[PDB]
Structure 1
Amino acid sequence: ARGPKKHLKRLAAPHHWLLDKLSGCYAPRPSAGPHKLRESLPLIVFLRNRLKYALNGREVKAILMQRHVKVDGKVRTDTTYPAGFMDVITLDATNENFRLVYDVKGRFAVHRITDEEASYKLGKVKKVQLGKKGVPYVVTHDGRTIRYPDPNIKVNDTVKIDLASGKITDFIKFDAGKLVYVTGGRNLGRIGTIVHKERHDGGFDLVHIKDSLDNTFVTRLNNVFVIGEQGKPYISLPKGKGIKLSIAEERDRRRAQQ
């Protein structure tokens, strides 16, 4: 390779970005950031082909350098800034916040909500360990680390970050009967009230997740992300509620209520 990869082409970019194969040969490559290369949505493409607010790369970059938008409470004037799942980006113009959530079909859906949901967000703990000077800490999916966590937080948990302070207001653990969000694989964007788990000592645990339609499926432990307790959510569910309806029923429901 002789070095790191600095370019990305269309048809070689992840599917959920929804880039047309014409009108160019290269894709907006996200540089180092809080989220993975594949499981993230760059700000430029997000502004371009999801809101249609801007129609040019030059106009998008000018918007970014004029400090008219900000991410997670920070301006972050990066022309290809990557913002992935559970990312909050508020807009001072009309003060509308967009949460980058996953739709039922498996693409980066955008949810427009108000200032309270802009302030409060959710994160998934990746690992919990002890740093230098006997300081314990955690790792989140977006890198939003909080120092000195409460000792109950273990791996595969979820926390609420106020985006302003460094204190975890709410924490939700991992057990049977919890509202979850599968982020990975073919079930991208499904809520299925986790039932049980097969550990399979040695790694690669499996979790049985069943939607309200009693559609039960399985997923890797690395893909499930608990988002709240049964009933009420911690964050607003996207349109479709993550059901993944059968093909005949979905098609005739589109035909009826088109």
Structure 2
Amino acid sequence: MARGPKKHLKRVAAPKHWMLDKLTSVFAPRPSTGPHKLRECLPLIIFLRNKLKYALTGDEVKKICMQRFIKIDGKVRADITYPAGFMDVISIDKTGENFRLIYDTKGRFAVHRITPEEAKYKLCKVRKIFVGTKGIPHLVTHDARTIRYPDPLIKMNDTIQIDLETGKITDFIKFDTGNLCMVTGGANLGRIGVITNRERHPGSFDVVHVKDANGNSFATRLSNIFVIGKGNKPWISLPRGKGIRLTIAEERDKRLAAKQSSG
């Protein structure tokens, strides 16, 4: 079957980090088309009945979205399979709560509640600079927003703080060694550490070393690096564990050390 694009998605080929079961039926939600990559998305309904358990059936989530209590990036969305991804803020204004989508140290989108103050902006990577007609420059970001007239000194692999309401960036970082970074793709995920070094090749990818403040060195491809703030100075509130990432032996030891699994 290949006379056009498919529309079903199974459960057993579903991207594994949404933590689905398999004794519910064959299908899984499928992200609809949008700004983030299909693998990198967390569909809306999985945050609302397969995490926080406001709803219990998919029809219930549709009944929440219809009354429009949900926002994403300060605008109103009303699908059940809206494709939100990394660095967005969800905002329920009927609870007074704001969430942030960020990577756990085990590489899955966690619940990271935040102040309303922080929830007025997000961190956006620059990917492309493109001169349009009549000599105007542009930015292009991973959340796929086109912000016209950027000041010229911003280059790709940099990051920019965006004001959700108005565009028109507040600050930026210029990519270099000794800046604090998060990993967003690759087999490493959610790890935090300073850049330390870069390496360039002519075509065919290139890699970027990273080192943290716990004395571990690891590397990742260039295009999986994301900047979060100046050296040892995050401009976001980080979820617990701080991207350090333990081994399984040490992690076991903590649970049996406090002797705690309930409270």
- TM bucket by the smaller chain? over 0.9
Q: What is the letter of the counterpart of residue 38 of structure 1?
A: R
1:107-159 Cα deviation digits (max 9, x unpaired): 11121112111102111111111112222111111113321111011110101
1:58-90 Cα deviation digits (max 9, x unpaired): 000111111111111111111210100001111
How far residue 17 of structure 1 moved from its aligned partner, in angstroms, is 1.1
- Match of 2:175? 174
Aligned residue pairs total 258
- Match of 2:257? 256
Q: Is the 8 A contact 2:194 2:232 kept in 1?
A: no
- Are 1:31 and 2:32 counterparts? yes
How far residue 203 of structure 1 moved from its aligned partner, in angstroms, is 3.8
How far residue 177 of structure 1 moved from its aligned partner, in angstroms, is 0.7
Gaps in structure 1 of 5+ consecutive residues:
none
- Counterpart-to-counterpart distance in 1, 2:256 and 2:23: 31
Q: Percent sequence identity over matched residues? A: 71
Q: Equivalences for 1:89-238 in 2 at 5 Å?
A: 89-238=90-239
- Match of 2:53? 52
Gaps in structure 2 of 5+ consecutive residues:
none
**What secondary structure does 2:118 align onto?**
helix
- Counterpart-to-counterpart distance in 1, 2:55 and 2:28: 17
Q: Is the 8 A contact 2:105 2:189 kept in 1?
A: yes
Q: What is the letter of the counterpart of residue 50 of structure 2?
A: N
Q: What is the letter of the counterpart of residue 19 of structure 2?
A: L
**What secondary structure does 1:219 align onto?**
strand
**What secondary structure does 1:168 align onto?**
coil
Q: Is the 8 A contact 1:179 1:192 kept in 2?
A: yes
How far residue 35 of structure 1 moved from its aligned partner, in angstroms, is 0.3
Q: TM-score, normalised by structure 1?
A: 0.97
Q: TM-score, normalised by structure 2?
A: 0.95
Q: Is the 8 A contact 1:95 1:114 kept in 2?
A: no
**What secondary structure does 1:44 align onto?**
helix
**What secondary structure does 1:117 align onto?**
coil
- Counterpart-to-counterpart distance in 2, 1:64 and 1:112: 20
How far residue 225 of structure 1 moved from its aligned partner, in angstroms, is 0.5
Q: Indicate the structure with greater strand content.
A: 1
- Are 1:85 and 2:95 counterparts? no
**What secondary structure does 2:47 align onto?**
helix
- Match of 1:75? 76
